[PDB]
Amino acid sequence: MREIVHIQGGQCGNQIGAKFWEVISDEHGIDPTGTYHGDSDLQLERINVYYNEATGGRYVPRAILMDLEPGTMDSVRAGPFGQLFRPDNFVFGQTGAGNNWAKGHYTEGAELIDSVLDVVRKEAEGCDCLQGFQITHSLGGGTGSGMGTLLISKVREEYPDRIMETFSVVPSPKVSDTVVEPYNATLSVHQLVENADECMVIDNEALYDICFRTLKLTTPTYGDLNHLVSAAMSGVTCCLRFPGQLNSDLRKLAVNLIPFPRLHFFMIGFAPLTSRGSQQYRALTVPELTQQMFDAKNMMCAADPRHGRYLTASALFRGRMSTKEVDEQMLNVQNKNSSYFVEWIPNNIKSSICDIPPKGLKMAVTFVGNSTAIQEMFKRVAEQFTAMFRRKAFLHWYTGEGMDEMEFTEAESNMNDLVSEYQQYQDATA
């Protein structure tokens, strides 16, 4: 039923998936014990997209929990809604990656990836008609950034026709979390451009700024950020799970947003985001949703979208409305912001409609965009990598696992090639 599987590795991916699954269970009316307690029939005809079925009338998510240390999974199961994931989907190393890309990708990752690949293969073969894969990970860690991308490479080698969609959280230069961040970041993103059909970037700076300035929460935790990420996650596959006037699946998004095979990096956003103070004092309508979803400060990335130009964009309206306002607003915003949209391609805005809004809301908008402003991230990362690498700092830890500087050099050159070919479209005129 054009169903998809989930894979999550590293502690960031584990937390994101933990929140995402309870959001989906809330949307589908699934209790922590795995028994359906919904109200309307509309929650069961597409339940097989995300949940497999088991004896006793219960449902189980088709997600793989992968990591090189058991603490994260010990915490995620000990938390609420831990009963959903089957015990067999847990796979773990015992030494940890040490935030070292080589350890997580070559020494321990290579020897342990057999079991996770086996469970992935059996899960994929169990389903009727696979639609694709979705991945959640961090590029700045060891276990995620290494073994997740290794598994990406293997599954791309094994399943060439299916599509892959990745949610990667990348370092913002302001929040410094690890001193070896650029190394494993580039060694990961070097293999994404050849394998990942869709990559969507997420930033902790962006999440912090949004949660403080729009939501106005004085003491945010990781929970609300995870909730924002989960909402933006669930908005994407809405048309694939619920009826609507203009359905659009992941392959439609890919084909209709990718101009060229090496420009598959996106920035995402969600609407409506409002503070808890004025939840009832504003009107929720298509004009306001459209006005908010194009604001630069609502975007889930540190890059400023008004420093570049949009190539393609997509909006997935949810709820009951009329197409007139939708298309008219898209046309008007394209007309008024002609400077921010590249000119040699006309009508670069995607409109999709699903007829089921989120629980407790009326109309929601998920926005995904490809623009020439995302390369500021890559320029910063490349500059930082060059500054650290020019004297071979921290290099011996990597090289002691059989590593050589030629692959580092070619990955850095690949970054330069990507940024060059991605910025040369900014001034390209027919």
Binding site: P243, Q245, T323, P346, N347
Partner: protein
């Protein structure tokens, strides 16, 4: 004895089919469950329904239509909807994986395992039919499965049956307002396919219907359902001549012999009138002269085309209700006396009129009011080349740098197709601009 076979392919095709079959069910008085509520007996000497419905023998009737789509969403929705007892279950052909807005997916990779079943069902449907008149096909062009599968079916029926007439109520994209970005590609490809396979094509873009609803019904929040109802009304008004009385009965054959001077020029844009809500209806005149004059005004065109920028070649006007031929020809003469509509020199007579005696039916919960007179007009004009020119512009500006080409190439599509499609579109526009010259 006389029948027409209906094909609804693509999401837009299915969503138009829903409304048109609702309209037909209401018009013939058949219940949604499919049972005729008795009280139509007494030797019942009229098969007013064989054009669209065929009896099962005792009670219910089934339509002579087939539904095709690759995504099971809308098909399963119809299967679970209020019309679950009406349509034949396995003539609801449902695919498995969406064409993903790509022409190649629907024309070269996934369409083969569906077209065989579709042709088999069309054969089985036609076998029971004894007096088939032709095919009607409803599809959207700016969609992958729509364009590709519609093209493949048109090609297959073109060799399976041949001379049998087929009419296409295609939905081309609007000039500025549209949904996708890749629609020029598959639109050019689909017009390539249908040019040498469709006898008559009708323009049905969306923004014109939007503006019509805004101006006349005064509804500022329209949805696809209203447009579907308008298109359904057009179809019923056109086809009612086969199943109702008239002073001048017109068959579908009076299209490919009266509205198409040349084999290549068979694209027309339609119009419908009157369009009045229930509030302003009782305060108006709604005379034949007024409804005829309002039909020819540019803003009532179903398509975004300005007729004053081109000439007229052939107009077919069907009236239904209590209309009088004296008034009809009086209005026609007044139109001819009026200047701003000019015909081509080599066509001195250019009107074909049909009269039907059944007044239009009104749908509950609908927007239109109950009226005693209505007219449907189909026009062939040389100004239609504007939409083709603008579509060619939108094509080649972004084709110049080869965007999105890999998506088609890697699926199995040869790159050379775009060039020859550009070529025959250029040839067609050349023919249109050549015809418009004076003799």
């Amino acid at each position: 004895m006389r029948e027409v076979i209906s094909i609804h392919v693509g999401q837009g095709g299915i969503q138009v089919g829903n409304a048109c079959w609702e309209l037909f069910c209401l018009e013939h008085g058949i219940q949604p469950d499919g049972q005729m509520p008795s009280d139509k007996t007494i030797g019942g000497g009229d098969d007013a329904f064989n054009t669209f419905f065929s009896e099962t023998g005792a009670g219910k009737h089934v339509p002579r239509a087939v539904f095709l789509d690759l995504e099971p969403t809308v098909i399963d929705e119809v299967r679970t909807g209020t019309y679950r007892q009406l349509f034949h279950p396995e003539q609801l052909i449902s695919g498995k994986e969406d064409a993903a807005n790509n022409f190649a997916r629907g024309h070269y990779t996934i369409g083969k395992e569906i077209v065989d079943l579709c042709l088999d069902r069309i054969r089985k449907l036609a076998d029971n039919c004894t007096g088939l008149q032709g095919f009607l096909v409803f599809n959207s062009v700016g969609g992958g499965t729509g364009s590709g599968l519609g093209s493949l079916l048109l090609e297959r029926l073109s060799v399976d049956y041949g001379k049998k007439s087929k009419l296409g109520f295609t939905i081309y994209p609007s000039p500025q307002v549209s949904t996708a970005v890749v629609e020029p590609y598959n639109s050019i490809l689909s017009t390539h396919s249908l040019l040498e396979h469709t006898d008559v094509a009708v323009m049905l873009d969306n923004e014109a219907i939007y503006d019509i609803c805004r101006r006349n019904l005064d509804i500022e929040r329209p949805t696809y359902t209203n447009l579907n109802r308008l298109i359904a009304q057009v179809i019923s008004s056109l086809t009612a001549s086969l199943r109702f009385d008239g002073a001048l009965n017109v068959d579908i054959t009076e299209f490919q012999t009266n509205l198409v001077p040349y084999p290549r020029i068979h694209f027309m844009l339609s119009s419908y009138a009157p369009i009045i809500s229930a509030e302003k209806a009782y305060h108006e005149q709604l005379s034949v002269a007024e409804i005829t004059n309002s039909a020819f005004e540019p803003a009532n065109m179903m398509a975004k085309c300005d007729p004053r920028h081109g000439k007229y070649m052939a107009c077919s006007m069907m009236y239904r209700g209590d209309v009088v031929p004296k008034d009809v020809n009086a209005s026609i003469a007044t139109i001819k006396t009026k200047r701003t509509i000019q015909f081509v020199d080599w066509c001195p007579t250019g009107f074909k009129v049909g009269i039907n005696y059944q007044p239009p039916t009104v749908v509950p919960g609908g927007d239109l009011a109950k009226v005693m007179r209505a007219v449907c007009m189909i026009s062939n004009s040389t100004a239609i080349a504007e939409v083709f020119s603008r579509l060619d512009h939108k094509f080649d500006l972004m084709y110049a740098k080869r965007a999105f080409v890999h998506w088609y190439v890697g699926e199995g599509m040869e790159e050379g197709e775009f060039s020859e499609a550009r070529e025959d579109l250029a040839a067609l526009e050349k023919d249109y601009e050549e015809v418009g010259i004076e003799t």
